[PDB]
Paper text:
HiTehA is a trimeric protein; each monomer comprises 10 transmembrane helices (TMs) connected by short extracellular loops and slightly longer intracellular loops; a short helix is part of the loop connecting TM2. The ion channel architecture features a distinctive organization: the pore-forming helices are positioned at odd-numbered TMs, while the even TMs collectively form an outer shell.
We successfully elucidated the structures of all four samples with an average resolution of 3 Å. The four structures of HiTehA closely align, revealing a minimal root-mean-square deviation (r.m.s.d.) of 0.13 Å for all atoms, except for the sample purified in [name], which showed a slightly higher deviation of 0.26 Å. This discrepancy may be attributed to distinct folding patterns in the intracellular loops between TM6 and TM7. In general, the structural integrity of the trimeric arrangement remains unaffected using four different detergents during protein purification. Remarkably, none of the detergents tested appear to induce any significant alteration in the position of the gating Phe262 located on TM9. This observation underscores the robustness of the trimeric structure and the stability of key functional elements within HiTehA, even under varying detergent conditions. The identification of a linear density within the channel cavity across all detergent conditions suggests this cavity can be occupied either by detergent molecules or by other hydrophobic molecules such as co-purified lipids.
Author numbering:
A (entry chain A), B (entry chain C), C (entry chain B): 6 to 313
The structure:
């Protein structure tokens, strides 16, 4: 069993996203920039390591890669590989814009090709099942598009950013209804319950991407997106004891992405002087939660129960 | 069986909402203000009575309250208790702003807490069933958020109003697909058919809330919301003979809310000189329908077919 | 069995829509106007012929008309009759505005009445089944509303156009979730697979209607709509070998509508200097695909495989 679960790519993801959030506090709080760099740096480091390990998985464990790619539920986790890359590229845009652009384009093309080749195959049916409607399905169809849009906007391709952001947003709106209906009816097996954190991502990631493409302007759409994001955040906070029914696990990093985005957009909402108190609370809460996740990850690594 | 069905809270609700609509005609038609007050007054009175009776239900019929709260379908009707309260507070804002603000905040906190504790609990699964997808589910997740947004906007907290309005709008867009699919597939049981009126509420209530948050400015979003609201209104008018297949009943008050909002937004569309003829038609039709509902309720009360 | 399958109305539709697209290149490429006229003319002619045939079907094959109207899946194809009419009227607006207005109003009233009488009937349940969720359901509830909105905007009733466009857009985003879930779960029978082309229509048609109601202004909404439309175009391009698994057929004209709109909106995006390269690519691709469809139709007609 390849010691590298694909979902672990959420570790370099949530950190990387969080780094970007701190990057938006460069002017207001100088130390923030330093902090961001640290996150960025470590995130990049971790990402690179995972990529290497994943490369190994492809060379000597290709049967597992094929099995997960053809699976109707696990394939979505592969979408973490391009997403993180884009985010990592975004980080590297602060030092080497050329390498950042190359990574962003590679990740965008990769995620678009993956979604076209796999998310579109599900329409053929016969492999996807009503029990395969999971939050992780957001990653290829929703999260990847938002990440591509934000990364392209950071490069300056604002129109292409609008295109990718709209694709991701409408895909989110089109998938979430059936996902929530499935959760209400059948809910989710305990071992996938951690992935419920992904349900938090679309509402916030979206606005973050939006706030990255429209030059950080706070308008009605961003406020609406925060409305729904906070609704989902309260819903998941209520369910958190149920999510960890069998105890804490690395899968909780599924939350981090959304939480990270909740920080990112918060910075914008602080810059635009729109709900400054709520923005401060969201930023502090996201940082605290991601710090607790990092501490839990360090404890798991120390105890030796991090790799499967 | 406590003589007080929770759905009866739609009576003080539909009137109260309608009152607010008339309050928007104070400048254009002085007598309108007087009419609004009457509605407001009576609505408030009715609400208070029901609250008292509901308190009785809590003190001496707590088993029924627990049963309805734990039910996957009836719990939604409890959301009428905060909603109505908020609306009543809105009315009181024309006389005592402080009491109105206190009531609005109490109702907003109550509905948010109820949605967090219960609507998010359905994601645990095992109690919600495919046959429990009813229009009444709009009340906790959709109607409550729109009412809170409108009330907060009336108080002046416009940004928090956008947050709540967006939460409600996205929740509506996310729940309506599965609800309409269930209605198409499985025929709603006759005794629940009256609740089909709630399907009319989100399309109009939404825009009303929007028109209360953006200072009554008529833009593309409001026109789109009326587009879908009129589509649903025609759809339900076609189905009305089927909705009352087994005869008229107090449950038809489920329509009133939406109809009331149909009047409210209409006033704004009349002020903005956008579709003045359609605005007049919508206002007159909603007022006539609510008047017929009031006459039917009076007839039921006189005939002793109002209370269980 | 009547010789003109209702779905064949997509032939005069797809051409007609395409004609409108070319009509937007009158100022930039004079020959374009001529080309548009040609298409318009032929489209109109074809439409008229089909109308006559359908009249015949009503006079001497009313049993088949009743069967298709009462069917939960085939009824949607009847919605092509008003839609096409409206489009034909649009074409005639370049020569005789009065006849164009009469046709547009007749088509709008007809499609609205049809959707009210039938699409709202499905809510009763017992006739619509989970296996009856097909892309063709877009035609009465979504495509008709967008076509009516665009036609009314062309006449100058921009507010009524906004109403119809919003109705269509909200119906689209409320139906597509369950449709895509059904496609993922239960697939689609091969003889209906061609109708999956309709899945391409709403993302593009929508924006086209929008770009026809807002005077061709390119804003965030249109770019988002293209984002989703291009996502769907890629998804369907990937599936095209599977869509024609049993071979090419006239049903592929289901694509043309969407493709036609993809050209139409493209012209607007070219005028607004927004993604000019992508606009040119989309226009050329739509024209090439519709030309291939026309060639295939001519080949089928010559070989005698066109009429059933």
């Amino acid at each position: 069993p390849f010691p590298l679960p694909t979902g672990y790519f959420g570790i370099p993801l949530g950190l990387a996203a969080l780094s970007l959030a701190w990057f938006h506090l460069e002017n207001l709080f100088p130390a923030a920039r330093m902090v961001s760099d640290v996150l960025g740096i470590v995130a990049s480091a971790v990402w690179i390591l995972f990529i290497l390990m994943y490369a190994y998985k492809l060379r000597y464990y290709f049967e597992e890669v094929r099995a997960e790619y053809h699976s109707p539920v696990r394939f979505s986790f592969i979408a973490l590989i391009p997403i993180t890359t884009m985010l990592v590229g975004d980080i590297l845009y602060r030092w080497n814009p050329l390498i950042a652009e190359v990574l962003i384009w590679i990740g965008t093309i990769g995620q678009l090709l993956f979604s076209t080749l796999r998310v579109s195959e599900l329409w053929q049916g016969g492999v996807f099942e009503q029990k395969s409607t999971h939050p992780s399905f957001y990653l290829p169809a929703v999260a990847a598009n938002f990440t591509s849009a934000s990364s392209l906007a950071l490069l300056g391709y604002h129109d292409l950013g609008y295109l990718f952001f709209g694709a991701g947003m409408i895909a989110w709106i089109i998938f979430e209804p059936v996902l929530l209906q499935h959760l209400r009816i059948s809910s989710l097996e305990p071992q996938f319950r951690a992935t419920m954190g992904i349900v938090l991502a679309p509402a916030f990631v979206c606005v973050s991407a939006y706030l990255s493409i429209n030059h950080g302007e706070v308008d009605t759409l961003a406020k609406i997106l925060w409305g729904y994001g906070f609704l989902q955040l309260f819903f998941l906070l209520r369910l958190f004891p149920w999510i960890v029914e069998k105890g804490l696990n690395i899968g909780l990093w599924a939350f981090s992405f959304g939480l990270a985005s909740m920080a990112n957009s918060a910075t914008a909402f602080y810059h635009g002087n729109v709900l400054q108190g709520v923005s401060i609370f969201a930023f502090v809460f996201s940082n605290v939660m991601i710090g607790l996740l990092v501490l839990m990850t360090i404890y798991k690594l120390t105890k030796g129960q991090f790799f499967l």
